[PDB]
Amino acid sequence: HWGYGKHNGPEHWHKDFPIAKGERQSPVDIDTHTAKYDPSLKPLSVSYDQATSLRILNNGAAFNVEFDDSQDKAVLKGGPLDGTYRLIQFHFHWGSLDGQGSEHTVDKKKYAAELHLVHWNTKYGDFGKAVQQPDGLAVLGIFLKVGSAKPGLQKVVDVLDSIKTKGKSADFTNFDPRGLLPESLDYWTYPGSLTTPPLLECVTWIVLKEPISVSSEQVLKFRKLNFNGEGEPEELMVDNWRPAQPLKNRQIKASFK
């Protein structure tokens, strides 16, 4: 099955998922000089104060922190978006080394990791319906660089010991995702896809310009997770990122000058 090894990694995915070679695949390199400021873009509205986190899961590709998405408790609106998008989960992609790990790049620069807050368009009623629509999902992407610790990340880091292997989960209530944001909400946006199979072309990407800083110790703990299940040969969960894909017939817009 698909993964991030030499034998089943991103360069192989097209055989099972031909949309991998589609017209709006993600991630992409963000060429900052080519993106254009769009004065018609609105500020992002990130309304997370009523978010209800539930659980943290190792799914064999990353770990997801899942939220109650049965009501409009944590929603993304504004920016390039038409309508209301509910937070369902967040997860990260990261590297084996601090100089790689992000999926998007900025003028070809790779960050140590990238956080994805995944939201679905409530007009489609459920996530499974939303992913079948060109405007079904909105993903907020945030780069991580290594420097000072991110205080609001530590609760996530500290629970990882308990979800080491694929299939493990733990309670993860009362977590506030506002603690994972940078100061500025300036962003780039473009139409794209899921970055894991099934690679569906259903995402409005909103990638924040300002990275968050996390400490070396925080990211080192991500790298102790396992892709494998319990009792199987250990394969460290590292380099779980898809490389940049061709931009094709797309323009990246900036919310800032």
For Zn ion, give the closer residue by CB, 110 or 116.
116
The CB-nearest residue to Zn ion is: 116
Q: Least distance to Zn ion from the beta carbon of 33, Å?
A: 26
Residue 242 makes contact with Zn ion by CB under 5 A: no
Residues 105-124 that bind Zn ion (CB under 5 A): 116
Smallest separation (angstroms) from Zn ion to the CB of 78: 22
Cα 146 to chain centroid distance, Å, stands at 18
222 with 45: CB under 8 angstroms?
no
The minimum distance between CB 91 and Zn ion, in angstroms, equals 6
- Residue number with CB closer to Zn ion (116 or 150): 116
Output the smallest distance, CB 257 to Zn ion, in A.
28
CB of 116 to Zn ion, least distance (A): 4
Closest to Zn ion by CB, 102 vs 226, is: 102
Q: For Zn ion, which is the closer residue by CB, 140 or 146?
A: 140
Spatial contact of 147 and 167, defined as CB atoms under 8 Å apart:
no
DSSP secondary structure of 5-21: STTTSGGGHHHH-GGGG
The closest of 59, 95, 101, 67 to 178, measured between CA atoms, is: 67
Binding footprint of Zn ion, residue count (CB under 5 A): 1
As measured in angstroms, the least distance from the Cβ of 240 to Zn ion is 9
The DSSP element (H or E) to which 137 belongs, if any, is: strand 137-146
Q: Is 246 helix (H, G, I), strand (E, B) or coil?
A: coil
Amino acid at 40: S
Q: Residue 116 or residue 209: which is nearer to Zn ion going by CB?
A: 116
* DSSP per-residue letters across 183-240: S---EEEEEE--SSTT--S-EEEEEESSPEEE-HHHHHHHTT-BSSBTTS---B----
Q: Which is nearer to Zn ion, 104 or 116 (CB)?
A: 116
Contact residues for Zn ion, defined by CB under 5 A: 116
